[PDB]
Design brief:
This protein is mainly β and 691 residues long. It contains no helices and 58 strands. A hairpin with a 2-residue loop joins strand 45 and strand 46. The relative contact order is 0.07. Bound molecules: a molecule of 3 linked components (NAG-NAG-BMA) and 2-acetamido-2-deoxy-beta-D-glucopyranose (NAG) (8 copies). A molecule of 3 linked components (NAG-NAG-BMA) binds next to strand 26 and strand 27. It comes from Gallus gallus (Chicken).
Length: 691
């Protein structure tokens, strides 16, 4: 490629800037960067910040922000050689209003019981560039007292330390912070009234550390100041989440109406006045609830049993999830209630190694007299909430569980996106719930956690993703049944999905007598086999290995057009699209030359050196002639002429002088190649008098 030259970029600065390698502007202004490029063919330009991208030789950002600052890249490519890249660092600049805060420090003195008070005046401001701080008490401070930047701060903060605090120091101190007026940014000031009444905030709360309540109850909390100068600002907050709904803040008073169980949590009242540590009082609000009452049958452990056998230990545990967990109390009944007071032979244990906070009675030397219906009742002492119970019949019939997959739903295949339903079925007395997990990987579930409880033994997946395709485990719970090694069973999940073929579009060129073959290849797809391929031409079907091929015997006017191969797996369809013709490629205008020729500076005429190259001359039938059209933008009528080609090769520069052009005006130039097939791809350009 003799005349083809690789791209070359150069960034240029415009829009608003201020004051080498960097483009500094005030936040809120507008950025305007332009990428000038050269090389042939004329390269295209995208602005990016990664090296996302905007396809434009000029980058323009209105009302720029702090974060939009950074390094920007102009990328320019044309096919020939290595793409051109150029960088520029945009440094958006700003100066917010400074914050002024103060705290005291009392400290001992060597060999003395006298004490020295020290105040720290801390001035913080976020700014680009690094700010400049000046301190004043009406007058500028230099010396006796000290200025510095404290630790754990990168110059955004300066502190004025007043070591021994004598009355004359009690004045108004004012931090004035400047950005050097760079980018014409004003300085800003903040002042503080340091007085012997100045004091950090303090609060008193009308309720205890932790407050227990029932659902529905209205609860109101008064948070009142007990100290603070300046007058601090009191604020309530909640974790997790925000306060509302159903809760109103008078200010200081926080009331919660019709409290729901999910409203439980920490409510924090905090006072701030930029003096000392902000005061906070914290109350933990606990709404009562009881959920998920569960029992466990644990056969003799020491005899390593998994089954109810006479002459063995049988533990029957009991548990429920409650907010004031420590406050629950359990009652064990049996065909009516003995309240588990027997002890001898049958005994109560409330806290063994078993799960947390579980009442569990043991039966030593199990007897037929122990076969019965046992009930455990969890309750809160004199609480309005309802009690919860768990019945568990023990008899000869009670037996550990077994789990299986029904029929051959072991592997269940579905198409991506649809819903999937995995099923396990469990047998035993009692029948425990099933816990579904994934085994091929460690991912979560419908419930968003590693495992999911289910009693119907069904696991439903609404929007199934191919990523989810894998193996899944279903197993017996250790609760609401035997507490034994869970029984397990696996099911496979195939997530089929439609094909993806290549190329989506391809522009194919070839001479008039010659042949061409189009291939549509399948890259991804489950099933990964071409079930069928169907080729169409300009809308109509044609008659006809991982891919499909079609051969156009003779690329002619009758055969040239758009070909579509619709490849499909048993699940979906996807298509390649080919454009076949014997049209020559577009001419590529050459932009980098001094062009105009003044004809005797008279007749109001100049001439233009129109130059270009022919893209891929040997891709189709040889180029015979170019059709040249010239319009001057001002007259509708156009002068059409034909250039006859002498000879050409890839990259050869072509020329044609346009003879009669009004001396000031510009023109549109349309250049079309002609082969035996006819008109190739037309190209266009605007020419102008330069000098
Ligand atoms: C209802 O209550 C029962 C227990 O009373 C809950 O079963 C418990 O579920 C948790 C997981 O949520 C299990 O803890 C986990 O154990 C694995 C190891 O097995 C560990 O890797 C995890 O970090 C986590 O600690 C716990 O073992 C299990 N307890 C029993 C006795 O099986 C059940 O989840 C509750 N259901 C609901 C809907 O609240
Ligand atoms: C570049 O962006 C401007 C708007 O900022 C737009 O007017 C112009 O047409 C764009 N350039 C191109 C080549 O589209
Ligand atoms: C503080 O200063 C004021 C006058 O500025 C004075 O009335 C007061 O006694 C001083 N001492 C205290 C503890 O406020
Ligand atoms: C809380 O107040 C509302 C009316 O403001 C009332 O309907 C509700 O019953 C109150 N809460 C209780 C526990 O009574
Ligand atoms: C908060 O409520 C109490 C009475 O419940 C009242 O004395 C106090 O003024 C209230 N505070 C506000 C800011 O309304
Ligand atoms: C409220 O205080 C608790 C206890 O100190 C704390 O865990 C929680 O993060 C705090 N929440 C807020 C919003 O301050
Ligand atoms: C226990 O057995 C009784 C009668 O034998 C029955 O009414 C009750 O429903 C059974 N309980 C369970 C949990 O099966
Ligand atoms: C197919 O359609 C394209 C676009 O309309 C057209 O250029 C071509 O001549 C058509 N081919 C035939 C054989 O009609
Ligand atoms: C100047 O241009 C006009 C219009 O294009 C043409 O008629 C005329 O012959 C030209 N004169 C010369 C001296 O080239």
């Amino acid at each position: 490629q003799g005349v083809y030259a690789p791209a070359q970029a150069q960034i240029i600065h415009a829009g608003q800037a201020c004051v080498e390698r960097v483009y500094t502007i005030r936040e809120g202004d507008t950025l305007v960067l332009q990428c000038l490029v050269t090389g042939h063919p004329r390269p295209q330009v995208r602005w990016t910040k990664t090296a996302t991208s905007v396809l434009n030789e000029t980058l323009r950002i209105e009302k720029i922000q702090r974060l939009q600052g950074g390094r920007y890249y102009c990328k320019a490519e044309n096919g020939v050689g290595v793409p051109a890249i150029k960088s520029i660092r945009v440094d958006v600049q700003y100066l917010d209003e400074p914050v002024l805060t103060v705290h005291q420090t009392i400290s001992d003195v060597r060999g003395s019981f006298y004490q020295e008070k020290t105040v720290f005046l801390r001035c913080t401001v976020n700014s680009n560039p690094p700010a400049r701080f000046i301190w004043k008490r009406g007058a500028e401070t230099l010396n006796g007292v000290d200025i510095y930047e404290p630790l754990y701060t990168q110059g955004e903060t300066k502190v004025l330390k007043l070591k021994n605090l004598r009355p004359q120091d009690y004045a108004s101190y004012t931090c004035q912070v400047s950005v050097r007026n760079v980018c014409s940014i004003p300085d800003k000031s903040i002042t503080f009234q340091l007085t012997n009444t100045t004091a950090p905030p303090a609060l008193k709360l009308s309720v205890n550390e932790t407050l227990v309540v029932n659902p529905g109850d209205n609860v109101t909390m008064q948070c009142s100041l007990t100290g603070g100068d300046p007058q601090p600002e009191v604020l309530w907050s909640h974790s997790p989440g925000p306060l509302p709904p159903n809760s109103l803040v008078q200010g200081g008073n926080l009331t919660i109406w019709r409290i729901r169980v999910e409203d439980s949590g920490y409510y924090n009242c905090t006072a701030i006045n930029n003096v000392g540590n902000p005061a906070k009082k914290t109350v933990n609000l606990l709404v009562r609830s009881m959920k998920n009452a569960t029992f466990q049958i644990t056969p003799d452990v020491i005899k390593e049993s998994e089954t109810i056998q006479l002459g063995q230990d049988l533990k029957l545990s009991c548990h429920v999830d409650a907010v004031p967990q420590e406050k629950v109390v359990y009652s064990w009944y049996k065909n009516g209630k003995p309240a588990r007071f027997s002890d001898r032979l049958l005994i109560t244990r409330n806290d063994p190694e078993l799960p947390p906070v579980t009442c569990s009675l043991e039966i030593i030397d199990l007897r037929f007299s122990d076969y019965g219906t046992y009930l455990c009742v969890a309750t809160f002492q004199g609480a309005p909430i309802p009690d919860l119970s768990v019945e568990v019949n023990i008899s000869s019939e009670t037996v550990p569980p077994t789990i299986s997959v029904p029929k051959g739903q072991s592997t269940i295949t579905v198409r991506e996106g649809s819903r999937a339903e995995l099923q396990c079925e469990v047998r035993g007395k009692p029948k425990p719930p099933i816990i579904w997990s994934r085994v091929d990987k460690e991912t979560p579930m419908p419930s968003g956690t590693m495992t999911v409880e289910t009693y119907d033994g069904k696991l439903r997946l609404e929007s199934v993703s191919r990523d989810m395709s894998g193996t899944y485990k279903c197993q017996t719970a250790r609760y609401n049944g035997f507490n034994i090694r869970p029984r397990e069973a696996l099911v496979q999940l195939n997530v089929q999905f439609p094909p993806v073929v290549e190329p989506a579009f391809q522009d194919v060129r070839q001479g008039m007598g010659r042949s061409v073959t189009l291939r549509c290849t399948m890259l991804k797809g489950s099933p990964m086999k071409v079930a069928t391929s169907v080729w169409r031409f300009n809308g109509t079907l044609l008659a006809q290995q991982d891919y499909s091929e079609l051969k156009v015997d003779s690329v002619s006017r009758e055969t040239s057009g758009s070909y579509e191969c619709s490849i499909s797996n048993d699940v979906g369809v996807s298509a390649c699209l080919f454009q076949v013709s014997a049209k020559a490629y577009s001419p590529e205008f050459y932009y980098d030359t001094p062009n105009p020729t003044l004809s005797q500076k008279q007749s109001k005429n100049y001439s233009y050196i129109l130059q270009w190259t022919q893209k891929e001359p040997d891709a189709v039938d040889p180029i015979l002639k170019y059709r040249l059209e010239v319009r001057q933008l001002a007259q509708r009528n156009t002068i059409q002429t034909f250039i006859p080609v002498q000879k050409m090769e890839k990259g050869l520069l072509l020329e044609h002088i346009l003879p009669n052009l009004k001396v000031p005006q510009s023109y549109e130039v349309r250049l079309t190649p002609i082969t035996s097939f006819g008109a190739g791809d037309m190209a266009a350009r605007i020419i102008r008098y330069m000098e």
